[PDB]
Paper text:
The transcription factor and tumor suppressor protein p53 is the most frequently mutated and inactivated gene in cancer. The most frequent p53 missense mutations in cancer are found within the DNA-binding domain (DBD), where all mutations result in lower target gene expression through the loss of DNA-binding affinity. Structural characterization of these hotspot mutations revealed a druggable cavity in p53 Y220C, a mutation that indirectly inhibits DNA binding through the loss of thermal stability in the DBD. In this study, we identified the first covalent compounds that selectively react with the somatic cysteine in p53 Y220C to restore thermal stability to WT levels.
The phenyl–piperazine compound KG10 was found to have improved labeling (51.6% ± 0.7%) while maintaining a significant shift in thermal stability (ΔTm +3.21°C ± 0.03°C). Although KG6 induces a novel p53 Y220C conformation, the L6 position and overall fold in the Y220C–KG10 complex are similar to KG3, with an RMSD of 0.367 Å. The elongated KG10 molecule makes distal contacts with p53 Y220C, spanning from the core of the immunoglobulin fold to L6 D228 outside of the pocket. As predicted, the Cα methyl of the acrylamide is positioned in the C220–L145 cavity similar to the PhiKan083 ethyl, making vdW interactions with p53 F109, L145, V147, and L257. The piperazine makes H-bond interactions with D228, and a D228A mutation reduced labeling from 51.6% ± 0.7% to 37.2% ± 0.5%. In contrast to KG3, the KG10 3-position aldehyde is oriented into the Y220C cavity and forms an H-bond with the backbone amine of T230. However, W146 is shifted 0.8 Å away from the cavity relative to Y220C–KG3 and 1.5 Å relative to Y220C–KG6. Although we predicted the aldehyde in KG10 would interact with T150, the crystal structure revealed that the 3-position was facing the hydrophobic pocket formed by V147, W146, and C229 on the opposing side of the Y220C crevice. In addition, p53 T150 is positioned adjacent to C6 of the indole ring in the Y220C–KG10 structure, suggesting that a nitrogen substitution at C6 would further enhance stability and labeling through an H-bond interaction with T150.
Residue numbers in the entry: 91 to 289
Amino acid sequence: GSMSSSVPSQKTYQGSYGFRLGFLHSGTAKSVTSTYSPALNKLFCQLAKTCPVQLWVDSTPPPGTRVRAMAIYKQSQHMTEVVRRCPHHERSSDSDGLAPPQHLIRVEGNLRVEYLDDRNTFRHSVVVPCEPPEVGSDSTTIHYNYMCYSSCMGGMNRRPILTIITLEDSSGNLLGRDSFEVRVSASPGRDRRTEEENL
Ligand SMILES: *C[C@@H](C)C(=O)n1cc(C=O)c2c(-c3ccc(N4CCN(C)CC4)cc3)cccc21
Ligand SMILES: [Mg+2]
Ligand SMILES: [Mg+2]
Ligand SMILES: [Zn+2]
């Protein structure tokens, strides 16, 4: 589809503030809508359901810090192809009004969400202000939504993707980076259990 002339770095970088991702320990029951496999570093989730991702730091980042999410294809031969929604779902107009219909990754429950189509790389990303934990809480959670199945033909087309989360300062400079593989399917609990059986 759309071809980029670069590939974003995937290098894990904790940085000065000790940035890393956390996930709920949800298990693999049929009722789960998302579940994270530490052994695979892979999130399994359902189409358009909340995926809570925790942002952990050892120190408070400076004011105006933001958190960006971006998807890339995992396999080398696909990495320069921009990850985007399939034609069916793009023309489906199931947007909450804020998200571009071509974007795979949305953030829910945040009215300060900002979406970027990069003018040079053509990649899509979604960025929100990074907030410290709420009173009583230990971490900051962001609720992501994946708006296509991994099997959507004409979009991901059964190709595995990586989601890259970056902490950036107000000017856009990199403060930290982490990532995880994603599979979007109708049965994440079963898919995780099955893929873990095959290690
Ligand atoms: C923008 C976002 C990354 C942020 O500002 N942020 C995230 C977190 C935590 O996830 C933040 C804290 C924070 C960090 C750690 C703790 N705990 C207390 C006890 N636990 C077990 C270990 C450390 C609490 C709060 C603070 C400020 C920002 C922040
Ligand atoms: Mg990790
Ligand atoms: Mg090729
Ligand atoms: Zn789709």
